[PDB]
Structures are given as structure tokens and as C-alpha cells.
Amino acid sequence: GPLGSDVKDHKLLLFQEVTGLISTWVTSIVEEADWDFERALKLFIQKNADHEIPDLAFAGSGSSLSKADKRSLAVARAELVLEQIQQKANK
After folding, report:
1. How far apart are CA 87 and CA 81, in angstroms?
2. Tissue-wise, where is it found?
3. Which of 2, 43, 54, 82 is deepest in the core (most CB within 10 A)?
4. How many Å apart are CA 39 and CA 53, to the nearest integer?
5. Whole-angstrom Cα distance, residue 36 to residue 54?
6. 38: closest CA among 6, 15, 19?
7. Under DSSP, is residue 4 helix (H, G, I), strand (E, B) or coil?
8. Are 25 and 47 within 8 A, CB to CB?
9. What is the DSSP letter of 21?
């Protein structure tokens, strides 16, 4: 459809905003999770624990947080959103 690419852009940015990952890993994880926001967050957390997310996958804004602290913040944000998704389902 003529709107499909704008929807895909949005789903990528949804995940990118939560995780703070560069677009390269946003594409990789979102596509592997078949474009599902919740599954992509879970997949990011699993890949992170398995040492499959390089330091350079974490976006920056100047050189500021270390790569280790960017990683911890990204995981924490993804885990909080997953909790919010579960809490919204329960209501």
C-alpha cells in the first residue's frame, strides 16, 4: 500500500526511540522480530545479554555517557516499556 512505508518508518522509530540504538541495529532487530514492537524489545534484551549488540550500536549526542552507561540505560528503558505493555494489558 502507498502508506505502508510510512507505517514501517514509524514502527522503526518507535523502537529506535525506546532503545537509543543506531538505525543499523533498529532495522536488524525490528525486521527479525517481524515488525512487532514488544517482540523487538524482548529480542534486543536477549541479543544484548548474548553479547550480540556492539558498543557502537548505541547512539550518542556528543563526546556525556560512556558506552556501558548507554547500554544500561537502553536495556532499562526497554525493560520498563515491556512492563508498561504488560500493565496496560492487565487493565
Report:
1. 10
2. Expressed in female gonads (at protein level). Expressed ubiquitously.
3. 43
4. 16
5. 22
6. 15
7. helix
8. no
9. B
Which three cell numbers mark 38?
514488544
Experimental method: X-ray
Dist CA 35 CA 79 (whole Å): 18
| Cα–Cα distance measured from residue 73 to residue 77, given in angstroms and rounded to the nearest whole number | 6
CATH of domain 4-90: 1.10.8.10
Number of helices (H), then strands (E), in the chain: 4, 0
In sequence order, the β-bridge partners of residue 21 are: 58
Separation between Cα atoms, residue 46 and residue 87, nearest integer Å: 21
